[model samples]
Every structure is written in C-alpha cells, then in structure tokens.
Target: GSPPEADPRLIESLSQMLSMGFSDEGGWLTRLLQTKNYDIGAALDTIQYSKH
Candidate 1:
C-alpha cells in the first residue's frame, strides 16, 4: 500500500506561513498543528482567526 499523503492545501498553508516568518520550530506551526490536530481546514481557520 502507498503511504498516506499530506493535503496540498496544508502544504501551501505551511509555505505561506514560512513566508510570513513562522518557522517549523518557532511554536506557531506546532501550536497550529496541535490546535487543529493536523486538520488542514481547521488549521487554516485557526490562522485566519489569529490574523484578526
């Protein structure tokens, strides 16, 4: 069987976050991942809410 794949939307979000100066070890990404349980849609929602 093939390995499970990550969502492209999540990949894009991570790229955007990196561009916005969030690093993998900076805790932002880790917090987001924890908040959403790695769900892409939920993670996006968390980010959008944080922006406001």
Candidate 2:
C-alpha cells in the first residue's frame, strides 16, 4: 500500500520493470500487484481509456 507519490526507490524499480513491456490485461493495477504486492486499490479509481 503506497501513497499516490510512492517512495522514489520503489518507483524507480517498478518503472524499470514496467519498461520491459508488461501486459495491461487488468490494467496497471494488476501489474503492480503481481510484481510487488503493492495494490493501491487503483482498480476502484475508475480510469477509462479513450479510443478515438
């Protein structure tokens, strides 16, 4: 459980792993949880994508 602005070290490490092109199967939340068990309940944030 990290804040909106997570620790720099955690952020850097995650950013690097994500740069390797993880899937968005369940969106970034899934990826973050799987990689570090850092579920921030983002799935409840109601983010949407525009496909214009």
Candidate 3:
C-alpha cells in the first residue's frame, strides 16, 4: 500500500519499501520528483504492478 501523502517524515520509510521492490536506487520520491505527472495513483500502480 502507498502512503497518504508527500509528507516528509513518512517519505523515508515509504521510500525504503518502494526503493527495494519498485523504484530503483534512492526511492519512489526520486522518481516522483523527477517526473512531471507523478501522483498517488502512480504510486499505487507501481505496487499493484509489482510482483510479490
């Protein structure tokens, strides 16, 4: 599951999970920051599409 918001505090913990499984290197935030249309749905999609 994805976090509720872009709150800085939760980014680290959430990023850790995302980085390991979905996003490469730093974290999801890195991708989110780099992409123009990044959003919560994109986050959700990453997880939904991720293989367990």
Best by TM-score: 1
Best by lDDT: 1
The window of 10 residues in a row where model 3 has the poorest summed lDDT is: 5-14
Tens-digit lDDT track of model 1 for 1-52 = 1123443445456665745644454455666655435654444443443453
For model 1, give the 10-residue run with minimal summed lDDT: 1-10
lDDT accuracy of residue 38 in candidate 2: 63
- Runs with alpha carbons beyond 4 Å of true place in candidate 2: 1-5, 21-52
Question: Candidate 1, clashing residue pairs?
Answer: none
Each model's number of backbone clashes? Answer: 0, 0, 0
> Which candidate do you rate higher for lDDT, 1 or 2?
1
**Residue 45, candidate 1: alpha-carbon lDDT:** 42
TM-score of each: 0.34, 0.23, 0.24
**Local error of candidate 2 at residue 3 (angstroms):** 4.5
TM-score of 2: 0.23
Runs in model 3 lying further than 4 Å from the true structure: 1-6, 20-52
Please list the Cα RMSD from the true structure of every candidate, rounded to 1 decimal place: 10.2, 7.1, 10.0
Ranking by lDDT: 1, 3, 2
Could you arrange the candidates by TM-score from highest to lowest?
1, 3, 2
